[PDB]
């Protein structure tokens, strides 16, 4: 089916948080006691790259952002229909800019009366492959709409091992997603300068595990990392949001190490430079956006890293090598890593069959 | 297979096209399977190739399907096939670049011969269709020459070059 699902959040409705305000205005409390039915020997073909739920949560998040961070100037273009100099002029928009707090809140998605949601249970799921241990429910777990690129922030972990997912390998066109099984701490703290620290003792092991899992697809070649190849500042370097501040951070001292079956990285605290901004490139279309000056100071952020986004560089000039650069930026890609299980279904009772009896006439 | 010709110094557009009008992903791949550009959400990411700096794209037509590929400071060695990947098709185009000019920079006289230099891609046979203000319509292939150069032949001769039915106009520096 293609029905409309409603939000469900354990909001507060007393604080100044914009997420709390939106949840209070349009969301309802959670189910007091969930009920899950464990179906038996069934087999259904799951597909995640072609799901339809994401196309709705991605349009709900954008609506959510229209109540928290209003733009001082919202400069976007608009063209006039002319076959071909096609008319194209910039349009200006402006409103008030009152500084407000901002912290994501968990949100639940539920189906209305008449539909159900199947969820898988296999430990691997093969990506877009059929699984058997299925169950039926009416609502999803907690989801945080945290936004970022080049690195997945606070989010659910894997079951028992880090896994890699891709729509079609061997085409150097689709982003590769990786999910870990143990988060790695990150701490960012700071007028226009700040630093970020990540535990190297865990990050080295994480990279080792990722590479070890990765060699299977490409056994003979040698896997090597490399910094971004260039582009907009929002994708060349890590970018995220914290406390009404849009943090941009370079990530060069993490992908310069060429990797083999052995270690070649080093041999405490991994320093990471960061500088805030005021003129950013929007992710909901095209056009710049500007906000009010930053807060006085003393802003801290502590988060966990669970997932990762990696791209590939292929060609016929490759000579026993494989360079994996960091990418991302397609919010749909960032959000498919959370709704790759659930599938919305409707029940059909009717049926026609040939039997051995005959009507009495 | 649309084919275009360069000038060694000007830009050129190679437009794909769609009909959904929803900013669908795409790419621009050379004949060696190397990325050059490509939308990722609403940002831009240049390919790790030899044309990272010169490449560009119009960021206002993405809402209307047309995803051009503007290349600046074009050079001869850049002649090759390119391919779009709009939804699942393989819309592709070809470009050939050859630089036609005059070797004699400024030192010219009256009563001497003038020879032009054409640098065409190795493996192509464009035909130079020259044109002169005095009606000197010298017709030839890639290589052309002139045995006379005097005052009456002033002005940059509009000796174009055509191949496969497509012609590009060039000019020759003439100083006497």
């Amino acid at each position, epitope marked *: 089916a293609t029905t409309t699902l409603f939000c469900a959040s354990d909001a507060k409705a007393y604080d100044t948080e914009v997420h709390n305000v939106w949840a209070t205005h349009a969301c309802v409390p959670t189910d007091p006691n969930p009920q899950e039915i464990v179906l038996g020997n069934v087999t259904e073909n799951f597909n995640m790259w072609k799901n339809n739920m994401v196309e709705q949560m991605h349009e709900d998040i954008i609506s959510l952002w229209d109540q928290s961070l209003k733009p001082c100037v919202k400069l976007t273009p608009l063209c006039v229909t002319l076959n071909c100099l096609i008319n194209c002029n910039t349009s200006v928009i402006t409103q008030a800019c009152p500084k407000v707090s901002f912290e994501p809140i968990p949100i639940h998605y539920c189906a209305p009366a008449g539909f159900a949601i199947l969820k898988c249970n296999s430990k691997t799921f093969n990506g877009s492959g059929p699984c058997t241990n299925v169950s039926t429910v009416q609502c999803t777990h907690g989801i945080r709409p945290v936004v970022s690129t080049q690195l997945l922030l606070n989010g659910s972990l894997a079951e028992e091992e880090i896994v890699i997912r891709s729509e079609n390998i061997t085409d150097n066109a689709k982003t590769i997603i990786v999910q870990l099984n143990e988060a790695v701490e990150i701490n960012c703290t700071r007028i226009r300068q700040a630093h970020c620290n990540i535990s190297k003792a865990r990050w080295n092991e994480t990279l080792g595990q990722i590479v070890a899992k990765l060699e299977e697809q490409f056994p003979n070649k040698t896997i090597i990392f490399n910094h971004s190849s260039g582009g907009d500042p929002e994708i060349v370097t890590h970018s995220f949001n914290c406390g009404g501040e849009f943090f941009y951070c370079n990530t060069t001292p993490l992908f310069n190490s060429t990797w083999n079956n052995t270690r070649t990285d080093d041999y405490q605290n991994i320093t990471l430079q960061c500088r805030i901004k005021q003129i950013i490139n929007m992710w909901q279309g095209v056009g710049k956006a500007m906000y009010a000056p930053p807060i006085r100071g003393q802003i801290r952020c502590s988060s966990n890293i669970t997932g990762l986004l990696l791209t590939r560089d292929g060609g016929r000039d490759q000579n026993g090598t494989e360079t994996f650069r960091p990418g991302g930026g397609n919010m749909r890609d960032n959000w498919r890593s959370e709704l790759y299980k659930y599938k919305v279904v409707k029940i059909e009772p009717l049926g026609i069959a040939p039997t051995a009896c005959k009507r009495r006439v | 297979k649309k084919v275009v010709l360069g000038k060694k110094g000007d830009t050129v557009e190679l437009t794909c096209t769609a009909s959904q009008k929803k900013s669908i992903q795409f790419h621009w791949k050379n004949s060696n399977q190397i990325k050059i550009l490509g939308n990722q959400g609403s940002f831009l990411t240049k390919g790790p190739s030899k044309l990272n700096d010169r490449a*560009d794209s119009r960021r206002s037509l993405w809402d209307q399907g047309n995803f051009p590929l503007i290349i600046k400071n074009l050079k001869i060695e850049d002649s090759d096939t390119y391919i779009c990947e709009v939804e699942d098709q393989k819309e592709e185009v070809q470009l050939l670049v050859f630089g036609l000019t005059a070797n004699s920079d400024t030192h010219l006289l009256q009563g001497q011969s003038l020879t032009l230099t054409l640098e065409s891609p190795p493996g192509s046979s464009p035909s130079v269709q020259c044109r002169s203000p005095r009606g000197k319509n010298i017709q030839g292939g890639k290589t052309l020459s002139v045995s006379q150069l005097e005052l009456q032949d002033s002005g940059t001769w509009t000796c174009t070059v055509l191949q496969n039915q497509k012609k590009v106009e060039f000019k020759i520096d003439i100083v006497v």
Partner: antibody, heavy 121, light 112 residues
Framework: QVQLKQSGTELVRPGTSVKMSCKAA???????IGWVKQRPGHGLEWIGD????????LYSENFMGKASLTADTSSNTAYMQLSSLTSEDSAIYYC???????????????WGQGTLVTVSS | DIVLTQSPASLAVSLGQRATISCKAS??????????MNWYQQKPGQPPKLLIY???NLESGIPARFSGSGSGTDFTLNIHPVGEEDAATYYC?????????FGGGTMLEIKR
């Protein structure tokens, strides 16, 4: 941090045409550069504004027919060409960067050191 | 064009005292509420820098001493506290519409 540089000082004869260069090194693409002139007792006055990402043009009326700008993003260098030199054309010249879209002029976070030109025989 | 007039022509301040410079325009420049004025500073032997922009938002790296205010055709750049380093020539510019027009410039000298 974006940085700009310019060539050295020049002595030129009147009535000729000369070309100065400004080299910028983040690389600039789809940006929108302008040129500025400084002469004693006149403050400042912007001359020409071009957009390399398409080579878009915008001139000041007073300089019409006097200043021609060009750019080469391959070498990341803009060029100021001026002809019909006189004594009044002796001055300092600066190149100014920014970012794209038409009437931005709000993020001139840097300027070049400037080049001196003197018209004398 | 929008002709700008700055004041005062010459300005002297004792160290540690308030400083103010005014800029006036012949035609309004308000467009959706954002004030399109830029205040630049010039010192001998070095090129000018962007010191204040838009009259409501500060440029990074520049100490917080600077501020701006005003409306319509009367705007004011304020400096506090003044220091020995601030003796220089300050220019007020409009960033509304092309063509653009600089002001007359004002000279600030530290009084000791």
């Amino acid at each position: 941090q974006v940085q700009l540089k310019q060539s050295g000082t020049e002595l030129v004869r009147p009535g000729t045409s000369v070309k100065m260069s400004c080299k910028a090194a983040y690389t600039f693409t789809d940006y929108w550069i302008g040129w500025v002139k400084q002469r004693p007792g006149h403050g400042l006055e912007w001359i020409g504004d071009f957009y390399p990402g398409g080579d878009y043009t915008l001139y000041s009326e007073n300089f019409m027919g006097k200043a021609s700008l060009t750019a080469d993003t391959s070498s990341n260098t803009a060029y100021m060409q001026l002809s019909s030199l006189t004594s009044e054309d002796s001055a300092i010249y600066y190149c100014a960067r920014g970012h794209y879209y038409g009437y931005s002029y709000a993020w001139f976070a840097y300027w070049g050191q400037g080049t001196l030109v003197t018209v004398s025989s | 064009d929008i002709v700008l007039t700055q004041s005062p022509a010459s300005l002297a301040v004792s160290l540690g005292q308030r400083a103010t410079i005014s800029c006036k325009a012949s035609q309004s420049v308000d467009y959706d509420g954002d004030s399109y004025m830029n205040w630049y500073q010039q010192k001998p032997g070095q090129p000018p820098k962007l010191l204040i922009y838009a009259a409501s938002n500060l440029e990074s790296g520049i100490p917080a001493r600077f501020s701006g205010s005003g409306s319509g055709t009367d705007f004011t750049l304020n400096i506090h506290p003044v220091g020995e380093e601030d003796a220089a020539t300050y220019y007020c510019q409009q960033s509304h519409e092309d063509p653009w027009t600089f002001g007359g410039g004002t000279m600030l000298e530290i009084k000791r």
